[PDB]
């Protein structure tokens, strides 16, 4: 929603984790797991970043691995 996004705090941590890991979404799987758990706590459309996340979950599942 274009409202207070509960998960956007955690999304910041994903983004910055990525920079701390040179964009290795592999290393940021931990913190992504936290945005996952954050996202799944709500009716997904509640949050913009979470609405990105269930797509990221599909992406990671399509990737079938902790790759990238």
CATH topology: Helix Hairpins
Secondary-structure element order, as H and E? HHH
- Structural class, please? mainly alpha
Summed up, the domain count is 1
Subcellular location: Mitochondrion
InterPro entries: CMC4, Cys_alpha_HP_mot_SF
Keywords: Chromosomal rearrangement, Disulfide bond, Mitochondrion, Proto-oncogene
Family: Belongs to the CMC4 family.
What would your notes on this structure say?
- The PDB classes it as cysteine motif.
- The protein is mainly α and 68 residues long.
- The protein has one domain (1-68): CytochromE C oxidase copper chaperone (Helix Hairpins).
- The chain has 3 helices and no strands.
- Helix 1 (8-20) runs antiparallel to helix 2 (29-39) and helix 2 packs across helix 3 (48-62).
- The longest helix is centred in the last third of the chain and has 15 residues, at 48-62.
């Amino acid at each position: 929603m274009p409202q207070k996004d509960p998960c956007q705090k955690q999304a910041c941590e994903i983004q910055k984790c990525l920079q701390a890991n040179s964009y290795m979404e592999s290393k940021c799987q931990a913190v992504i797991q936290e945005l996952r758990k954050c996202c799944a706590q709500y009716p997904k459309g509640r949050s913009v970043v979470c609405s990105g996340f269930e797509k990221e979950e599909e992406e990671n599942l399509t990737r079938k691995s902790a790759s990238k």
